[PDB]
Design a protein around this ligand. Structure first.
Ligand SMILES: *[C@@H]1O[C@H](CO)[C@@H](O[C@@H]2O[C@H](CO)[C@@H](O[C@@H]3O[C@H](CO[C@@H]4O[C@H](CO)[C@@H](O)[C@H](O)[C@@H]4O)[C@@H](O)[C@H](O[C@@H]4O[C@H](CO)[C@@H](O)[C@H](O)[C@@H]4O)[C@@H]3O)[C@H](O)[C@H]2NC(C)=O)[C@H](O)[C@H]1NC(C)=O
Ligand SMILES: *[C@@H]1O[C@H](CO)[C@@H](O[C@@H]2O[C@H](CO)[C@@H](O[C@@H]3O[C@H](CO[C@H]4O[C@H](CO)[C@@H](O)[C@H](O)[C@@H]4O)[C@@H](O)[C@H](O[C@H]4O[C@H](CO)[C@@H](O)[C@H](O)[C@@H]4O)[C@@H]3O)[C@H](O)[C@H]2NC(C)=O)[C@H](O)[C@H]1NC(C)=O
Ligand SMILES: *[C@@H]1O[C@H](CO)[C@@H](O[C@@H]2O[C@H](CO)[C@@H](O[C@@H]3O[C@H](CO)[C@@H](O)[C@H](O[C@H]4O[C@H](CO)[C@@H](O)[C@H](O)[C@@H]4O)[C@@H]3O)[C@H](O)[C@H]2NC(C)=O)[C@H](O)[C@H]1NC(C)=O
Ligand SMILES: CC(=O)N[C@@H]1[C@@H](O)[C@H](O[C@@H]2O[C@H](CO[C@]3(C(=O)O)C[C@H](O)[C@@H](NC(C)=O)[C@H]([C@H](O)[C@H](O)CO)O3)[C@H](O)[C@H](O)[C@H]2O)[C@@H](CO)O[C@H]1O
Ligand SMILES: CC(=O)N[C@@H]1[C@@H](O)[C@H](O[C@@H]2O[C@H](CO[C@]3(C(=O)O)C[C@H](O)[C@@H](NC(C)=O)[C@H]([C@H](O)[C@H](O)CO)O3)[C@H](O)[C@H](O)[C@H]2O)[C@@H](CO)O[C@H]1O
Ligand SMILES: *[C@@H]1O[C@H](CO)[C@@H](O)[C@H](O)[C@H]1NC(C)=O
Ligand SMILES: *[C@@H]1O[C@H](CO)[C@@H](O)[C@H](O)[C@H]1NC(C)=O
Ligand SMILES: *[C@@H]1O[C@H](CO)[C@@H](O)[C@H](O)[C@H]1NC(C)=O
Ligand SMILES: *[C@@H]1O[C@H](CO)[C@@H](O)[C@H](O)[C@H]1NC(C)=O
Ligand SMILES: *[C@@H]1O[C@H](CO)[C@@H](O)[C@H](O)[C@H]1NC(C)=O
Ligand SMILES: *[C@H]1O[C@H](CO)[C@@H](O)[C@H](O)[C@H]1NC(C)=O
Lengths: 318, 172, 173, 319, 173, 319
């Protein structure tokens, strides 16, 4: 009489790598690298904002595309490709640094600068590039200042914003760059132009560039933007003698928020903590092979199609 | 393997054994039979579970974006970001491969160790009443009926009860 | 464990064995006693000492600051530095958790096997003069006085001497 | 039937550790791998160190009154405190952090005279109420405010050139004043339009004084921004200027190497250490540390963990 | 070590054995012999070869330069680049030392394992015909000529044939 | 009794390795894991490569005499050397290192004519004894020094536009002259005020000639400073200027990817390699390496370690 010891086995095992063997068959195993992505934005449990056609910077200056996004609060901010920031052609100095600050935030408050001007200076300057319901308009947070006496020299006028709040505010202004000499003289007169911006922890002088250049949206003139942070209790004086795009309001960034650059559609039914350009990644697996560019709490990216972890013994079939 | 049982002196596994990882087969005058061992099966299963739990546990480091999807990046800082990201990926890809390969080596040798531990437990139970056939069975030198086979599985077999019979059988 | 002795066929440890990690308990006509085995104890301790020396030896790598404590860093570079620092921290946290989980698994099984190796040594010394009870004890089939007992621990036990006495007793004669 | 038995020791209750398979595994003994403790001091034994106090590193090169005792020296460790002062007169340095890190990487400073001389129609002893020494108007020790000798008159075209005759590179700073209004600008430098060109063989750039109203800082709307560059051995650097330059009367030479620390923690000359952070010193022989991801020196690696216990004994199987 | 054989109950290794990692040395009426075991030797070698195969698998990660060798680097970005590189170096230096120390522990223990697995294979074959001497040999209680020795090595030895002879010799009759 | 013994092999003297528990573990065999040997020579077998020798990469785009052999071409590998020359006439480029990386990231250079033309009032063939060819005075080959046709006269206001009519972006470069003195400026361009304004649809700026005294580099007190930008397909870039511009005769177009190596090691066309450093090549199947932390290509990772022996055998227990 006889008693035999043994173990189980299966008809179809699974291959795994070990320290000593690339091709080891075990009874069972499970995947450790995530291969699947949900091709959409899982926004359940998130007070989110879909900017759509509005580009983040557009929120601060007030492009027609961004009228519904001039203020608000959120935990998640979604940017889309080809979002319009500047209706009138130009760009921003340190544009990407500014963009990240916005996408790092959980909201925007706007505060009035209280800027008010002389009768010589006309602030109601609009353009054909920034229309609103047919009629011509301008960036809603700024004003275009020109001489109402066309040709005459732009007055030596001072404007000052003080920050009385307990938190730092983000102020933006713009410098106009004419397409020619004749144009430059019409608006702000014949003198050589300078614009100073002074605060206790920032100074910088700006001089309008002038020269014939291509028409972006039927406009050879440029309006470029600059920005700095104004600390609590400090004020910021604006000495200018021509060509200042002056702010009517200033911004304040509130809280913290996760920024997501993706065109994939929004789903309020699924939730996720990891996002990438292609969509969302819901997985309890510690690795992924979908992209090395993700935001949130993500599995670590690896260059691996698969890595099976053994969940059973060496398979030794009959 | 390290413990020399699975893919060792045990020539192969039993595909007909569904209700366990390790178990007994027997043979006597009444017939043959097969039962699974719970203690040894759970020891292996629990150890696998521990690893799976370590695998899936959360890392809460929330990372922000440092690379615009929809616009250009300045060249010098882009080449810096690329270098760092790629170096990080090579590290994780390496760590991952090393993790699994080591864990797989351990799970396999762990399971081997539990098979052996069962075998040793039974060897010591039977004491001088049985001998090893070298293929993972014990040849019993006395009539061991079904209730006797059950006694060995349930760890209640008293060697001293069958010793006089077994010894004389082993010696002629 | 891996080697089936500690938390295995030996039911539990001895809280009274303060002079060593592994050891013996005997019982004879004279009485009972206890004694630690020096060799198997040092084998275990030395291997542990070797792990601690790998752990405490200093990576001299000198680092300097790239983030100002007291003044404002520019945003983009600060974000890059942050991203990099968090990535480096995640790696070393994973490495630390892995080192310790694995080193622990090893020390446990290592200690288990030094118990088994002591048991095996003794089994082979005793040869045909004793039998295994299944709980780490050897039932000896001859009169083994205190001096005989210490010879087994001292590893000077000569199985020849007691062989036929034991074989007779193992077969009732 | 006499008997021999084999066993292993145990304890009442040992410590708990983690393994690959078990979250809660009891062992007879263990030890910590992650350092949790820090000394809230700066351990400076065996270190020639300089506590800058209220003097900001950049203040050493240009000579702010707060730095009068830190214009020269040699050290292996340099300590910076919060809110320290670099500028008595309001202004900023171009590439300020790059310069700060460069100073904090160093092991001393030497000062070398430029010997710059000016015509008699230049007042080289300009002073300000913002920089005081003994209730009297003064100026950055290592620089000179240049203004027209006679009020309102046009500042003359001057040229000054420093020569590095040393076997090592020297660090030269100069400043550019930006007056509060055009009225003030004409008192100090005259009716001209003003240019200030600076050039060596490794570097050249021009500077035009900004003019504009701006908030007073220490009662001063005017600003003096600073610029810097390195001048190689044998090379010369030339200043072509018609008014607005704040000229160097001395240049600096950074010496050797040293470790730079930003912390407000007090100094202790009786403990030694090789690792530092904002909160003080870390001298552990453990490989890891959970105090800060911002440390300097020869430091254990930072981790997000309260504790990681390393087994130093077998499984505890108690009675 | 872990499995108690190599640098364990086997006192030392054989420098005269050049055609294998593990093997046999026998002694009988005819005289002595020696032979290497193929399967045990290959198990060990194949497993080492698998470690080497993993060692030299290349990653196609093409890296570019981010530091000029001949021109100067801006200070802030250079200090950042230095900080990152040195951090990566520290990680790889640590990783490399851990890999090699961990593999070396396992390779050695694995070697120990295959020696034991061979001894265990033999013990079971011999059954009640031989006894263990504690030093890695088996004292055999019956005439076992070179043909018989070869059948032990070949794994074709039938314990039945010598059981009676052996058993008589063991109990002394 | 007949006896059959089991045993294992050993050697005369083995190799030491480290384990988790032992620094001094003797085994029967081991192999190194860290590569210490470099080939002190660049292994270019199987690479369509270009040795710049004395030419600096930026010089390729502007046309320094040293770079005459390297104004165009194609390659998969580009080798730069120490002291390589970019500027026969003294000056520098804005964002110099970004430009240099872009070129070293590339696999070729096409050249395309801007097709600019000038009136009789401008002399477009300005030369200098700093950039010589055939002993005679010359200038950067891809650029033209524009000055007034008659010494002293005012430079005429001019407008030149380069139109990109390609399927890909082109790299345009220009320069600015910084006269060494007032009289030089007035000779070359005239007494008038001088402004140079560039303008694309994604770039515009303004430049003014920094007049001022400075050291002579290659016997020149003047300076030509270079700026660059990328013109996009279709987009046009326009140059308004009245003297002081160093205009382009040709723009550049970068073709495909390539590997950039900075090393002064001699080329060897017999060996092949995928990893390189300042001191040569690294050919190894090993995963680690301790020659240098600065490398390029597909390399083993750098470790701060002399040797790490991997055990390839059992414990050595000699007789
Ligand atoms: C980022 O990290 C890199 C790499 O560590 C740093 O670059 C290194 O640091 C120093 C830069 O100044 C250099 O150290 C000095 O080198 C001098 C020249 O000797 C050689 O030069 C070449 C470089 O082309 C080296 O590879 C060779 O080793 C040569 O031997 C030494 O003379 C000098 O020693 C000092 O000199 C002073 C004189 O001022 C003496 O009074 C004193 O006795 C002292 O010993 C020193 O060793 C080093 O060459 C350089 N290495 C490389 C590869 O570039 C960067 O500085 C770091 N970046 C930042 C921003 O911190
Ligand atoms: C830092 O790292 C990033 C990512 O590695 C680099 O960005 C990549 O740069 C390369 C250029 O070397 C780009 O490759 C080119 O893509 C063009 C268009 O591809 C689009 O569509 C794909 C679809 O999947 C997208 O993934 C992609 O993002 C693009 O939107 C191709 O037309 C190019 O082809 C040209 O080159 C090949 C060379 O083999 C030739 O054969 C062709 O004839 C042709 O001339 C090319 O494949 C890539 O698009 C960029 N990726 C991203 C995500 O932006 C940065 O450049 C790098 N920084 C550096 C190197 O400084
Ligand atoms: C890179 O990472 C660092 C580290 O995370 C990060 O700096 C940190 O975040 C902010 C910097 O703005 C600091 O937190 C603030 O500062 C102090 C905290 O002591 C307070 O003034 C603030 O408290 C607010 O708390 C509430 C919001 O939770 C508000 O309701 C309340 O009104 C307060 O305003 C606030 O917590 C934090 O201290 C730093 N850390 C360090 C070490 O400086 C930095 O921002 C990152 N860099 C970039 C470019 O993103
Ligand atoms: C006076 C008039 O009606 N002129 C018409 C031209 O505007 C137009 O030709 C185009 O003119 C463009 C400039 O136009 C605006 C603009 O930016 O859209 C119109 C704004 O009202 C004007 N005013 C203010 C307060 O900003 C604004 C501004 O002066 C300039 O932008 C300053 O740079 O200009 C532009 O120059 C185009 O290049 C040009 O084609 C023609 C169309 O045929 O009709 C004219 O009657
Ligand atoms: C007209 C004249 O005197 N020519 C000869 C001198 O040039 C020369 O003395 C040296 O002059 C050097 C500077 O000269 C050039 C040059 O770069 O070689 C001449 C160029 O023609 C001129 N510009 C153009 C557009 O052609 C160029 C330019 O003005 C400056 O480079 C701008 O900074 O200058 C140099 O300064 C030497 O230091 C000086 O000795 C003598 C030889 O001694 O021969 C003269 O015939
Ligand atoms: C426990 O371990 C530590 C070393 O890690 C030691 O200080 C302590 O004495 C140990 N306990 C013992 C040996 O009982
Ligand atoms: C702005 O700040 C300056 C200095 O603190 C002060 O002189 C001025 O009165 C402040 N307020 C306004 C509105 O300008
Ligand atoms: C600096 O001036 C001296 C004359 O005092 C001269 O010999 C030297 O060449 C000049 N410039 C340089 C770069 O050495
Ligand atoms: C080890 O020695 C063997 C010969 O015994 C030979 O392959 C070489 O010298 C060494 N190889 C390895 C992989 O260690
Ligand atoms: C460039 O020039 C051409 C011809 O003058 C013109 O048709 C075109 O619109 C210009 N700008 C472009 C294509 O952006
Ligand atoms: C492993 O996965 C397969 C499929 O889900 C299943 O047959 C097996 O029960 C699983 N076992 C474990 C331990 O996860």
């Amino acid at each position: 009489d006889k008693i035999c010891l043994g173990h189980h086995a299966v008809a179809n095992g699974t291959i795994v790598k070990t320290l000593t063997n690339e091709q080891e068959e075990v009874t069972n195993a499970t995947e450790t690298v995530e291969s699947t992505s949900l091709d959409r934005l899982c926004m359940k449990g998130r007070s989110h904002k879909d900017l759509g056609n509005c580009h983040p910077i557009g929120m601060l200056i007030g492009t027609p595309a961004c009228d519904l996004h001039l203020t608000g609060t959120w935990d998640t901010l979604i940017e889309r490709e080809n979002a319009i920031a500047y209706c009138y052609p130009g760009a921003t100095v340190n544009e990407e640094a500014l963009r990240q600050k916005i996408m790092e935030s959980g909201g925007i408050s706007k505060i009035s600068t209280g800027f008010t001007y002389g009768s010589s200076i006309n602030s109601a300057g609009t353009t054909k590039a920034c229309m609103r319901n047919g009629g011509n308009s301008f960036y809603a947070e700024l004003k275009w200042l020109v001489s109402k006496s066309k040709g005459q020299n732009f007055p030596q006028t001072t404007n000052t914003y003080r920050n009385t709040d307990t938190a730092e505010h983000l102020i933006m202004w713009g410098i106009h760059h004419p397409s020619s000499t004749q144009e430059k003289n019409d608006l702000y007169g014949t003198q050589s132009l300078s614009i100073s911006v002074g605060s206790s922890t920032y100074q910088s002088n700006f001089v309008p560039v002038v020269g014939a250049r291509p028409q972006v949206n039927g406009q050879s003139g440029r309006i470029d933007f600059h920005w700095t942070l104004v600390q609590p209790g400090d004020n910021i004086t604006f000495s200018h003698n021509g060509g200042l795009i002056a702010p009517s309001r200033v911004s304040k960034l509130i809280g913290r928020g996760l920024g997501i650059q993706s065109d994939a559609p929004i789903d309020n039914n699924c939730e996720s903590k990891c996002f990438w350009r292609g969509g969302s990644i819901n997985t309890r697996l510690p690795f992924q092979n979908l992209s090395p560019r993700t935001v949130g709490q993500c599995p670590k990216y690896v260059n691996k199609k698969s890595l099976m972890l053994a969940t059973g013994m060496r398979n030794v079939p009959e | 393997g390290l413990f020399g049982a699975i893919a060792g002196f045990i020539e192969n596994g039993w595909e007909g054994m569904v209700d366990g990882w390790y178990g007994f087969r027997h043979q006597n005058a009444q017939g043959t039979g097969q039962a699974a061992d719970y203690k040894s099966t759970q020891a292996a299963i629990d150890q696998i579970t521990g690893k799976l739990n370590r695998l899936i546990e959360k890392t809460n480091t929330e990372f922000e974006s440092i690379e615009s999807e929809f616009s250009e990046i300045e060249h010098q800082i882009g080449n810096v970001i690329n270098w760092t990201k790629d170096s990080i990926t090579d590290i994780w890809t390496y760590q991952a491969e090393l993790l699994v390969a080591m864990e797989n080596q351990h799970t396999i040798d762990m399971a081997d160790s539990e098979m052996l531990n069962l075998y040793e437990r039974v060897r010591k139970q039977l004491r001088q009443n049985a001998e090893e056939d070298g293929k993972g069975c014990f040849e019993i030198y006395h009539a061991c009926d079904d209730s006797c086979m059950e006694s060995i599985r349930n760890n209640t077999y008293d060697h001293s009860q069958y010793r006089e019979e077994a010894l004389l059988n082993r010696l002629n």
